[PDB]
Design a protein around this ligand. Structure first.
Ligand SMILES: CCCCCCCCCCCC(=O)SCCNC(=O)CCNC(=O)[C@H](O)C(C)(C)COP(=O)(O)O
Ligand code: SF4
Ligand code: SF4
Ligand code: FES
Ligand SMILES: [Zn+2]
Lengths: 688, 119, 112, 62, 93, 185
């Protein structure tokens, strides 16, 4: 037989493996597993309400009670450790009668509001009541009730339906790191709440909607909109940040209803951030849908695809080859970036780069812009040194795993950068390059812990790449990495954290800026979804073409607007901060007369008298295979090949300006969230 | 692809050149049960839908709008791959993401912090 | 009469293909009279149409698949012989018939 | 009075005075002809709204 | 002295290889013992080293306008790889 | 006469190489045989004195896309003399021809034509195997699991063409599939 849900049991050694009899079947489990986990290995799925595999054990609900031969009373299988030779019994009358008793107690004060509950067709309480519960209720007295409390603009609260499993409290205390929710009171009158009118300000606060087994905690924007049985589930990835969390887009027709997490033990581990969860609102607002060209007076008129392409192809032949600049956006996929690079190269230019970390970064060796330690590999680190990075706002899930490691392995975190708020205890070593200089030479008290740590982990932020002293800072970081051993064959510690979903693919494909002063001396700028660049930098004589799906400040400057499809409407490959390549699956139809980015660039190349060998998405991926062949071997764990020793010696001077913060508004980062209605009211009341 | 069964089946040649995804749907995040797992499905990527300009209903022109979600289900990846191979569909396989059972104990909630260190 | 037993080799499949093709050829005059195809199509354009269908299904090497194809073709021929199908249907199926394909498809719609 | 939407019509019904801290709303005089029983806690200052009927209940004395 | 004019003629040098194979081992040796020298002599040339599992050892070179030339480094030694790079640098542009 | 007696008698009397699976239950005594022994088994079960099965109730196909032999053909049989029912099943894929039983049971012709129409299974020695239910010129076998519920083509009247024509299907409101499956099943 196979474990429930295809769960993989990792046996550290064959010696430490006890044997249990779940239902007369011999089961081998490691020492430390509980009765519930042993049953899960044996294909038996025990009912549960308060137990979560990512939260600490708390045997409240008493729903997982089973029978054990050497036990006078039923044991809570979620908390009872498995012993060698133990005989578990799950389908016996004792465990049954216990399950109906517990269900009868749970459904005693529960409100009769299944029809209006947003957990209607997806509730564990009623699903288990049908299966493991009884048929008739013996309760006739008056039920209890509680008032509802405001937890913010994201979590809708109806605590009359609370079953008091305390999963939200445990999540807030352990995973989120923001202790603001707790069980208040004693007895049947105990309630979940924050006591003082306050709102859930955690970037992971939206995950309490999922961990709640009942409709007590539900999404406020996705309130009453639809039922779960009406929604088609698409397994897609994230593009808001460079973590690339695995999500599940649910849609009802041509619009996206909601986004919920998807299991991935190596990237997100069942959680997503609020920005990921509530970015679907912007996909249906201010969407560009028709090609548009400015008029003589200065107004945009809707134009067919043929005429817009004709205009841009006619203007592209009137500018000098080095006058052409193509800038890719943060949401761009690898194929379209490759097509854009080919198009600009054939025209005689070499100025192609991405929105963010594209100031001249050397992408020559691929360990200098990737998390050489996997995200899941950060759990083995003993000391984190965050050099000018704020993972809480940049890569919120990497912050989640850092908090997990700190609260479990008692790791130490040393932070070097601008003042910020952390959900774990951190030591503020400094605020600028002088701190790195102090660390490198030694005698700093944190250097003792750095050199006395078995598995240190240095994490450098992507914002450290736009500075003028980038080479000096990278050299000093590598000197720290070499002197205090962090890069070894058995453990790699040097990490670089990117902020944009397209940065890893752009650096892999060679999309690196050549001339720093290239956007001021340009005459044809092709803003391929790049609305996060300063449009005031572009000269007033330049012909700016904006290719995107949302209207932003770049639209007010563009001369031609070419509508494009969002990440939920196309097949594209994105690379994580760790170099892991994933693909998005289309979920909803493209709105209006908008086309895929690579299609638009290919059509423009054809109209501009430039032939491109590929004509389909399969042809482009063959071209990528000759540039970055790891962007087509999707879902493969390929580690870095070389180390920091190959970089040439660079004796520059490190500057004195303190590090800046790259994300000011966590809820306003890309164009989709910038056009969303939920993110506006989130940044209006949740940000301080 | 030896799509001979596709030729002797009756599917029109236009729909025999579709690109499909073979995958195993994962457990929903809002429920802890693991009953709807282990089955493999063929995703036809049928996204071409619009809105009826009389009542707002969702219109479609794709015959494979819900076949893979409603009727076409397989018990293994090999079965779905063989089906796609015989029907001549260009397929790609997405391996499912499975949980890893780690050691968790109730006593870990109550762990000694250590001797008070005046560091 | 009865459906023939399944073939055992490719030679039998080829023989049945030739027999079915000859049967369709003998069926040509009857269609010219049941439907007013006299001043419509030459008596050899249809023959070329069946030849082209056989030739573009000629990459099959499985005798069972060939037998099923022959059976379906014979069923279609029997249906056409009867007045079951409408007149324009056979004329809609049995008639023999600049920048870039990609750019025209791009101008048409996003879904290729 | 078709110009009044149901929201405005239910916003004009004065709240029902209840002496206790909790009231059970069924939606009609005959229980079988109303909505499922709903117990509403009157421990706030604003009137408490039934999630089925829209009727508002306010505590009488304290 | 051809190692000092690589950036003058070329515009990008990609060296595809595999990190776990016995066919790309001379390519790995060439990268290890020559990347620092070439990069030091040509600070602005983007010498990209990209590796995957099922990849044959190659060596690409973009030129003035999209022109690319590739050499299969599958049966060459390290001096042979260096000579192939010399041919790309010299005869290419 | 009964499931307990028919099971034992057919276990003893029947040749062993014919049947390869025998279920004895209250839902029905089934026999599973190879497609090359179906006709022999039914001829035996139609003529034997203690198993006088003289009524063929119906022939139905079942589609199992996950199996190598995709289609399951079920023969529901009735014995009026002994007041008993017997079910015989075989398995065939899309490109094998199974033997026809019209020789033994004359009524089998229409159910065999319906099975061929609905699933695409061909029968050897069938006097006339042509579609019986679907429209003239129908392409595809609707009762297969991979066949879309609404089909591929649609029918409407074309005024310029002055005849009823067939066009690719285009629904004004698509079929909404509701997933009611529970994870605690
Ligand atoms: C109005 C009339 C109505 C009916 C018209 C007919 C409609 C259906 C047409 C039949 C459709 C089919 O695929 S039925 C026929 C399909 N069967 C085959 O194609 C066999 C494989 N072909 C070969 O073996 C050789 O290429 C061969 C071509 C034999 C010769 O070449 P040689 O001998 O050198 O080997
Ligand atoms: S939480 Fe579940 S059982 Fe309670 S009202 Fe909502 S759907 Fe019904
Ligand atoms: S609000 Fe939900 S998660 Fe929190 S204790 Fe109540 S039922 Fe559990
Ligand atoms: S799941 Fe074990 S007592 Fe609640
Ligand atoms: Zn009410």
């Amino acid at each position: 037989r196979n474990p429930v849900g295809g769960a993989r049991v990792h046996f550290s050694n064959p010696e430490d493996a006890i044997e249990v009899f779940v239902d007369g079947y011999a089961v081998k489990v490691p020492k430390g597993f509980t009765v519930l986990q042993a049953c899960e290995v044996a294909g038996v799925d025990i009912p549960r309400f308060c137990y979560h595999s990512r939260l600490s054990i708390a045997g409240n609900c008493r729903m997982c009670l089973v029978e054990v031969e050497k036990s006078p009373k039923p044991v809570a299988s979620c908390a009872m450790p498995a012993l060698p030779g133990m005989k578990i019994k799950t389908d016996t009358p004792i465990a049954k009668k216990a399950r109906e008793g517990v269900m009868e107690f749970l459904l005693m004060n529960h409100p009769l509001d299944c029809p209006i509950c947003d957990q209607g067709g997806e509730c564990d309480l009623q699903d288990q009541s049908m299966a493991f519960g009884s048929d008739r209720g013996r309760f006739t007295e008056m039920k209890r009730s509680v008032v509802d409390k405001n937890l913010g603009p994201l979590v809708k609260t109806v605590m009359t339906r609370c079953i008091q499993c305390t999963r939200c409290v445990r999540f807030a205390s352990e995973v989120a790191g923001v202790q603001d929710l707790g069980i208040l009171g004693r007895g049947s009158g105990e309630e979940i709440g924050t006591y003082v009118e306050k709102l859930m300000t955690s970037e992971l606060s939206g995950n309490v909607i999922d961990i709640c087994p009942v409709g007590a905690l539900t999404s406020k924007p996705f309130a009453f909109k639809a039922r779960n049985w009406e929604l088609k589930a698409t397994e897609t990835i994230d593009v808001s940040d460079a973590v690339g969390s695995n999500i599940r887009v649910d849609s009802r027709g041509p619009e996206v209803m909601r986004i919920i997490p998807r299991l991935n033990e190596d990237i997100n581990e069942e959680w997503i951030s609020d920005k990921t969860r509530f970015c679907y609102d912007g996909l249906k607002r201010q969407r560009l849908s028709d090609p548009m060209i400015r008029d003589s007076d200065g107004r945009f008129k809707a134009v067919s695809w043929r005429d817009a392409l004709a205009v841009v192809g006619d203007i592209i032949h009137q500018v000098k080859p080095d006058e052409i600049v193509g800038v890719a956006g943060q949401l761009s996929d690898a194929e379209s970036m490759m097509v854009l690079k080919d198009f600009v190269n054939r025209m005689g230019s070499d100025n192609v780069w991405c929105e963010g970390t594209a100031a001249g970064v050397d992408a020559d060796l691929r360990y200098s812009y990737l998390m050489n330690t996997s995200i899941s590999g950060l759990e083995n680190a003993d000391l984190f040194l965050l050099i000018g990075t704020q993972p809480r706002v940049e890569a919120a899930m990497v912050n989640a795993r850092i908090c997990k490691t700190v609260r479990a392995s008692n790791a130490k975190v040393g932070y070097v950068g601008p003042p910020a708020e952390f959900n774990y205890d951190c030591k503020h070593l400094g605020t600028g390059p002088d701190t790195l200089k102090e660390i490198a030479e030694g005698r700093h008290p944190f250097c003792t812990a750095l050199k006395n740590a078995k598995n240190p982990a240095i994490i450098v932020g992507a914002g450290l790449f736009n500075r003028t002293d980038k080479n000096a800072i990278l050299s000093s970081v590598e000197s720290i990495a070499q002197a205090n051993n962090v890069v070894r064959p058995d453990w790699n510690g040097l990490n670089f954290l990117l902020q944009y979903a397209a940065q890893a693919a752009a650096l892999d494909l060679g999309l690196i800026q050549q001339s720093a002063k290239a956007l001021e001396s340009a005459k044809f700028v092709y803003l391929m979804g790049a609305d996060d660049v300063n449009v005031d930098k572009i000269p007033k004589d330049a012909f700016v073409v904006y290719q995107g799906h949302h209207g932003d400040k770049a639209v007010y400057r563009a001369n031609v607007i070419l509508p494009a499809s969002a990440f939920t409407e196309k097949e594209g490959t994105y690379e994580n901060t760790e170099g892991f390549t994933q693909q998005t699956v289309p979920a909803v139809p493209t709105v209006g007369d908008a086309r895929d980015d690579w299609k638009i660039v290919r059509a423009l190349s054809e109209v501009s008298g430039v032939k491109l060998p590929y004509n389909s998405i399969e042809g482009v991926r063959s071209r990528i295979k000759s540039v970055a062949p790891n962007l087509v071997h999707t879902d493969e764990r390929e580690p870095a090949a070389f180390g920091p020793s190959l970089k040439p010696e660079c004796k520059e001077a490190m500057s004195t300006t303190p590090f800046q913060t790259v994300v000011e508004n966590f809820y306003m980062t890309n164009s989709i969230t910038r056009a969303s209605k939920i993110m506006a009211q989130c940044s209006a009341v949740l940000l301080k | 692809k030896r799509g001979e069964i596709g030729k002797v089946s009756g599917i029109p040649e236009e729909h025999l050149s579709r690109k499909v995804i073979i995958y195993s749907p994962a457990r929903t995040a809002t429920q802890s049960g693991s009953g709807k797992l282990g089955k493999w499905k063929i995703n036809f990527v049928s996204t071409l839908k619009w809105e009826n300009p009389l009542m707002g209903w969702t219109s479609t022109g794709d015959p494979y709008a819900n076949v893979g979600d409603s009727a076409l289900a397989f018990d293994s990846e090999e079965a779905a791959k063989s089906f796609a191979e015989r029907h001549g569909w260009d397929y790609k396989v997405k391996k499912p993401n499975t949980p890893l059972l780690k050691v968790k104990s109730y006593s870990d909630n109550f762990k000694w912090k250590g001797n008070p260190q005046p560091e | 009469i009865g459906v023939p037993p399944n073939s055992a080799n490719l030679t039998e499949a080829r023989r049945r293909v030739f027999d079915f093709f000859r049967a369709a050829c003998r069926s040509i005059p009857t269609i010219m009279d049941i439907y007013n195809l006299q001043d419509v199509v030459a008596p050899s354009q249809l023959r070329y149409a069946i030849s082209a269908q056989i030739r573009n299904n000629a990459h099959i090497t499985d005798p069972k698949v060939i037998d099923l194809l022959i059976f379906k073709g014979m069923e279609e021929l029997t249906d056409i012989v009867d007045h079951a199908k409408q007149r324009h249907h056979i004329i809609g199926q049995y008639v023999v018939g600049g920048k870039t394909d990609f750019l025209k498809n791009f101008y048409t719609s996003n879904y290729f | 009075r078709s110009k009044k939407s149901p929201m405005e019509l239910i916003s004009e019904v004065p709240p029902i005075k209840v002496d206790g801290r909790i009231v059970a709303c069924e939606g009609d005089t005959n229980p079988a002809l109303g909505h499922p029983i709903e117990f509403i806690c009157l421990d706030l200052n604003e009137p408490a709204i039934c999630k089925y009927c829209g009727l508002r209940y306010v505590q009488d004395h304290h | 002295a051809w190692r000092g004019s690589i950036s003058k003629s070329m515009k990008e040098l990609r060296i595809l290889l595999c990190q776990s194979s016995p066919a790309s081992a001379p390519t790995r040796t060439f990268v290890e013992k020559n990347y620092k020298d070439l990069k030091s002599l040509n600070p602005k040339l983007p010498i990209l080293i990209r590796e995957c599992s099922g990849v044959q050892p190659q060596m690409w070179a973009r030129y003035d306008m999209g022109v690319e030339r590739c050499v299969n480094l599958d049966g060459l030694t390290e001096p042979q790889i260096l000579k192939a790079l010399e041919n790309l640098v010299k005869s290419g542009a | 006469m009964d499931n307990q007696f028919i099971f034992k008698y057919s276990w003893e009397t029947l040749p062993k190489k014919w049947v390869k699976k025998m279920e004895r239950s209250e839902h029905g005594n089934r026999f599973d045989t190879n497609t090359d022994y179906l006709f022999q088994l039914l001829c035996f079960l139609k003529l034997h004195t203690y198993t006088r099965v003289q009524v063929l109730i119906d022939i139905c196909g079942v589609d199992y896309p996950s199996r190598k032999r995709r289609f399951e053909v079920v023969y529901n049989l009735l014995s009026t003399r002994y007041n008993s029912r017997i079910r015989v099943q075989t398995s065939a894929d899309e490109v094998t021809r199974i033997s026809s039983v019209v020789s033994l049971f004359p009524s089998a012709g229409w159910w065999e034509r319906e099975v061929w129409d609905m699933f695409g299974v061909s029968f050897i020695n069938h006097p006339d195997l042509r579609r019986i239910l679907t429209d003239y010129g129908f392409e595809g076998h609707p009762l297969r699991k991979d066949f879309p519920l609404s089909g591929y083509v649609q029918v409407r009247y074309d005024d310029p063409e002055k005849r009823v024509v067939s066009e690719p299907i285009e629904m004004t409101q698509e079929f909404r599939y509701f997933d009611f499956a529970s994870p605690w099943e």
